[PDB]
Structures are given as C-alpha cells and as structure tokens.
C-alpha cells in the first residue's frame, strides 16, 4: 500500500471544527455512525445522502466488508481519538497496525463538492504549524500590532467599557466563527434560510470576496520553497574546506555510530589525577575521559538547553580530535551566500553556536567558491590546511535562480553552474476564466 | 467615486531577482547591440552581467516596505513585536519574527489593490531589432521592461548559458514573449479599453 | 579556468605554534574555513627568477 492508499480517518475535533458546520449549512442528514453491525450499503446511502463521504465511528470492531468499502471509496472515518485504532477494525489479513499510518493534511475541497463554502487551502494550516501556540493575550497583541501597521485605531476593540466595572478585555480569538441566531435560552440555533438572511450562512472568515481572491495567491506565495529561507539544524564536522557549493552537507562516514545527546552520557571522572569530563559510549559502555581516541560518533543534539560549557567545549574537542560529527537540530538560522571576493564578513565561534539562546535566529554565512580562478602556477605551496566546522543540514540555495555566469574555457560550462528554470520564461496565456497558465507541454 | 483601487503604471512584483558579482571576471570582447535591442534586452543584460556570482529570487523589498514593518535584509521576511512574549521584552533577532513576517506578507498581499494602467510604451520597427528579439517582442512593450533571463538569449557572452536558454526556449512547452498580446478581454471597455501585456 | 591576477581574498590564517608541550583547548574555535599553519616564517620562496 502506498502512503496515499489505506483507510482515511480524522479526529472528531477536526470534524466539528471544519466539516460539520458545512453539512449543517448544506441541509443534509448528519452522517451515520458506524457500529460493528454496519453493512457497506448503509454507508453508501449515507455518503450519497450527505454528498460528502464521511462516517463518524461509534463503537465496536468494524466488520471487513465495511472496512474494504471505506478503503475502496476513500470514506473518511471520524474517530473520537487515536488510542488502539486497530482494535476498532477487524483484521482479516492482520495487515493493519497502530504504528503503521501516514498523517497528512487533507483539504476540505477534496471532500466537499460545493466550492462556494471553501475559502482556503492546506497552506494556512501549514502556516499555523509554523506559529507558536498563542495565549489569548498574545493573540490580542498580534491583532493590535497588525492594526498599528495598517494605521487603524483598534483601541477599546474586544473590550467592555463599563462605567462601574472598568474596562474589561475579552478574548479576541474566534477561529472558524459563524453568525448564528440564538434561542432566548442562549443556546445556538442551526442556520435557517427561512429566518436568518443568506449573508449569515457562511462567515467566510469575515473577509471581502476580493481579499479572498488575493489571499489564495498569497498562500501560494508564503508556502513557496523559494521563500522558505529560514533553516534548521547545523552539522559540525572537522573537515577540510573542499566543496565550492554553499549547499554541501558532508555525508557521515561508514564507521560512525548514531548517538542521541543526553546529559547522562557526560560525567566527572578520575583519569590520571584529573577530573575529566568522561563520555560513556552507549553501545560498548566504555568510558573515555579524553576527547582524543573516542569511537567515531554521529551525535545528534536535539536541544542544547541545559548543556554545560564543559560538555560543549568537550563535544567540540571530540569533533576536532575524535572526529565526531555533531548535528544540532535546535538551531534556526538564515544564510547569506557569500561569493569568494566578499569573504566572510561575520564570524561564529563554536562557543557561541553551543551557547546561543534557543529561538534566536543565527545568521550563518556560506561561501560559493565556484568563482575562484585557478592559482598562479608560481604561487608558493600551502604547507597548512584550510578547515571548516559549520555545515547546513539542508539545501540552502533555494532562492538561487542562476549561478556562475562566466565561461569555463570559452565554451564549456563550469561544474555546478545553474541555468535558469524554464518556467522563469514560460509566459503562457490566461485561462478561459482569467487565471495564469504555463504553455501546453505537448500539443494535446 | 470610492478609491477602491490604486491605479499605477509599470508594476512592481512581489518577487525580484538579486545578483552578486565577482567583478574580476569580464569578457574582453565588447558586445554591440542595436539601440532598440539594447532598450529592451538591456536592463536584463546589465543585471545578469558576466562575472555574476549568483542570481537569487528574493521577495521585493521595495514592495514589502518598511511601511509594512517588514525587514528583508536577511533573506527572510521579519516583523518585530507581532508574535511576542507578554510581560517581557522580546529578544532581539527572534526566530518568531520570521513567522510574523509571513503574516504581514500575506496581509500585505491580501490587501494589494493595485490596478495596472499602461505606462509609456514603444513600438520598435521590426528592422531595428535582432531577429531573436523581434520573435519575442509583440509589437508594443513597456519602456520599463523588467529583467528576464530569456532576454539573455544571443546576448549573454556566457556561451553555456546561451546554449541552455536557447534550448529551453526551443522547447515546445516554453515560449517567452513580451509586450502587447491578444487577451480574451481585448476591446472590452471600462471608460478605456482593457489590453494585456 | 583562468589563473587569477588581482590579489584574491583569502581565509584568515591562524598560526598554531606547537612546542614540546601545550594545553590544546577548542573553546571559541572558528567555524569559518581557516588556515592552520605551524611555522611563522613561511615566506621562504624569496629568490625570483626573471
């Protein structure tokens, strides 16, 4: 089974939050619960009823014809939670397993057939995945900020200004809100075309149609790979400066052992009348007081937070002497790509890389050495060796359209030269409706 | 009338090419285009000049201005005091700024109400242009051509580049063209005729 | 491909000066490419050949 193939399913909270209001707004029966006693035909009647292909899971193990109906028709089961999911399904082939799924965003447009009630895409969720979880006051702060940038006087917004109780700030957060009539009891009523006006049907995130039309284009912009210029993780490896390309990530050598960093690995110890910072290799269990002579180690550091200066200096020493490779995933960074003539304007000592606060953006610089002309035949030999510690874990040159606009010889291309992508030049046509398009690839 | 739109000529994009040069490289031979072909092809050619280390595609700093609170000096968008800790000053160079930057990009795009008007144009006679340019040009074109790598064709003295660009443009699937074109909206009126460039 | 003529920009050239005995430490080692070199007087090719 491909990761795409299998039984789709989602948590109830997602269904309430994104699916169910649309069912209510489209005047269709609420999709059937599926118990153990559920023929596929009932599921078909339900899917054709709601025009949506969704069934809430109620209780009990689900019989196999039903399961295969859900698999073959891509029905989205909605489940209370993710505990013991497999026990909720009969396993005729026992292929199913709790650890064996593939989590992925699934746009509402792929479920609903009615475009009128679908304003956004996956990209907003991806952007929210970029955000820190916000306390309600932080949300209010963000809103007041954006307002200040747009020169809006948002004072007293989201607040009661009672004469006797004083000012009282209410929460501004109201994600996926709708305008809905309430019974005098205060409880919410389902939207009704008979009484509530059509405008109240769907809030559309409370934005103008034009702002939505541009919002879509903007979401395509924000989630472009080429804009994604904030990078995570840095490999530290003592290595000669060889590859011209900025985007180089040295591969880990054949003999290395992966080892998660942990405070438990490092300790004080006696060793020849000194209290050395011993590291005990998790496989062999052997203790090595010295940074020299330790086993080759691909150590991964998920978080530097509590790490002592002693241990950090010692890990760096192991990178230099035992030739450790130390990936550091905590770091987020930007990367100006320098060209050899402009040199390395900024500098980063290993101490600062091991001790910079989390959440600060590091600004690393990486030379593209490709435009470095060959040395004079009569320049004196280098007795020494240029070295390097910092490497990216990921490609850096995402923003790069072109490279080495010069000739090797007068006719050859330099190795590593980058031609512009064809799409940079495609200027096709407008679609039948107005939208931009690339030219047809073939005649058909 | 309501000021629903910001009518402007010669529009700026959300993205622009940036370009770093190693100045020690210079082709010895000096290319001499006709003045017309220089008027069109030229802004491209000065940008993607010989000895250019790398061409980048950054967001247009001119469009996402400091007016939006956005910085773009480091390659990413950044906006201060948007997503911040409460009760303490946010640390300098915080990574959260990048996420803030994205919102204010998206916002600044959701609110982009520019309405294009044709700017100054030129209608080169076919003979003035080298054939490779005339095949791209479509009668009239804006005097402020932007840059485009497709315009380097048969002008860049970087042979391999001209070879690769000529290949991509001799493919069926890609056709550079610039200047006035026949839109479905041609001849439609709205006080003035709509046209497409 | 061509040999450079203008003076090229170079990595900073730290000179380690290892002796009989020394306490190597690696705090604040530079991460940028760097030229380790052990001797001071390495401008040794003096005698020019016209």
């Amino acid at each position: 089974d491909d990761l795409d193939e299998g039984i789709r399913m989602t948590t109830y909270d997602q269904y309430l939050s994104h699916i169910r209001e649309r069912l209510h707004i489209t005047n269709v029966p609420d999709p059937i619960y599926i118990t153990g006693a559920s023929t596929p035909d009932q599921i078909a009647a339900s899917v054709q009823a709601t025009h949506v292909a969704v069934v809430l899971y109620q209780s009990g193990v689900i019989n196999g014809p039903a399961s295969t109906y859900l698999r073959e028709n891509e029905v989205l089961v909605v489940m209370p939670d993710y505990y013991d999911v497999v026990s909720r399904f009969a396993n005729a082939n026992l292929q199913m397993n709790n650890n064996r799924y593939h989590e992925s965003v699934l746009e509402i447009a792929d479920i609903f057939d009615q475009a009128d009630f679908i304003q956004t895409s996956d990209a907003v969720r991806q952007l929210r995945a970029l955000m820190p979880t916000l306390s309600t006051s932080q949300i209010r702060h963000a809103i007041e900020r954006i307002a200040q940038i747009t020169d809006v006087d948002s004072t007293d917004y989201g607040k009661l200004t009672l004469r006797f109780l004083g000012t009282l700030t209410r929460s501004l957060k109201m994600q996926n809100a709708q305008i809905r009539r309430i019974r005098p009891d205060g409880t919410v009523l389902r939207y009704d075309d008979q009484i509530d006006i059509e405008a109240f049907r769907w809030s559309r995130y409370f934005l103008d149609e034009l702002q939505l039309r541009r919002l879509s284009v903007g979401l395509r912009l924000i989630t472009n790979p080429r804009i994604a210029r904030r990078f995570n993780g840095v490999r530290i490896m003592y290595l000669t400066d060889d590859d011209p390309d900025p985007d180089f990530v040295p591969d880990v050598p054949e003999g290395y052992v992966a080892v998660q960093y942990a405070h438990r690995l490092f300790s004080s110890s006696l060793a020849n009348k000194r209290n050395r910072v011993t590291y005990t290799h998790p496989p062999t269990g052997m203790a090595y007081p010295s940074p020299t002579g330790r086993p080759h180690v691909h150590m991964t550091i998920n978080e530097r937070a509590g790490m002592s200066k002693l241990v950090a200096d010692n890990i760096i020493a192991s990178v230099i002497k035992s030739n450790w490779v130390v990936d550091i995933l905590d770091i987020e960074y930007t990367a100006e790509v320098m060209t050899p003539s402009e040199g390395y304007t900024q500098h980063v000592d290993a101490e600062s890389i091991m001790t910079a606060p989390k959440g600060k953006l590091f600004h690393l610089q990486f030379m593209d050495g490709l435009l470095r002309p060959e040395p004079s035949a009569f320049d004196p030999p280098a007795s020494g060796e240029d070295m390097r510690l910092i490497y990216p874990l990921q490609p850096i040159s995402v923003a790069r359209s072109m490279r080495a606009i010069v000739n090797h010889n007068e006719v050859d291309r330099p190795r590593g030269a980058v031609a512009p992508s064809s799409y940079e030049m495609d200027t096709g046509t407008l679609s039948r409706n107005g939208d931009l398009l690339y030219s047809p690839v073939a005649n058909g | 009338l309501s000021d629903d739109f910001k009518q402007i000529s010669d529009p700026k994009g959300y993205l622009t090419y940036s370009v770093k040069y190693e100045d020690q490289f210079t082709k010895k031979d000096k290319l001499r285009a006709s003045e017309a072909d220089d008027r069109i092809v030229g802004p491209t050619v000065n940008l993607f000049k010989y000895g250019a280390a790398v061409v980048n595609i950054d967001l247009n700093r001119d469009f996402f201005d400091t007016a939006t609170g956005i910085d773009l000096t480091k390659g990413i968008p950044l906006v201060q005091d948007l997503l911040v800790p409460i009760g303490v000053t946010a640390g300098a160079e915080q990574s959260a700024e990048y996420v803030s930057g994205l919102l204010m990009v998206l916002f600044k795009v959701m609110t982009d109400n520019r309405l294009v008007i044709v700017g100054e144009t030129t209608t080169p006679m076919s003979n003035t242009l080298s054939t490779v340019v005339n095949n791209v040009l479509r009668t009239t074109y804006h005097n402020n051509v932007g840059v485009n790598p497709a315009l380097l064709r048969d002008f860049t003295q970087v042979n391999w580049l001209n070879r690769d660009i000529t290949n991509m443009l001799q493919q069926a699937g890609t056709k550079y063209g610039l200047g006035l074109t026949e839109t479905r909206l041609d001849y439609v009126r709205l006080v003035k005729t709509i046209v497409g460039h | 491909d061509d040999v450079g003529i203008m003076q090229q920009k170079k990595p900073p050239t730290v000179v380690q000066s290892r002796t009989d005995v020394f306490n190597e430490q690696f705090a604040n080692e530079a991460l940028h490419p760097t030229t380790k070199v052990i001797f001071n007087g390495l401008d040794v090719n003096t005698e020019v050949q016209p």
Partner: peptide
C-alpha cells in the same frame, strides 16, 4: 588591484498612473 564583489537588484519604478488629456480614438 584587489579583486572585489558587488551586488545588484532590479529597481522599482511603479508610479501612480499618469493623467493624460489626449485620447487615441474617436
């Protein structure tokens, strides 16, 4: 002479639309 490096980025030119008084067609 020392080797050097420089940068460039395409210039903005986005003016407000001109108010012409002439008209091209009858």
């Amino acid at each position: 002479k020392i080797a050097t490096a420089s940068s460039a980025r395409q210039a903005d030119v986005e003016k407000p639309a001109d108010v012409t008084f002439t008209i091209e067609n009858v």
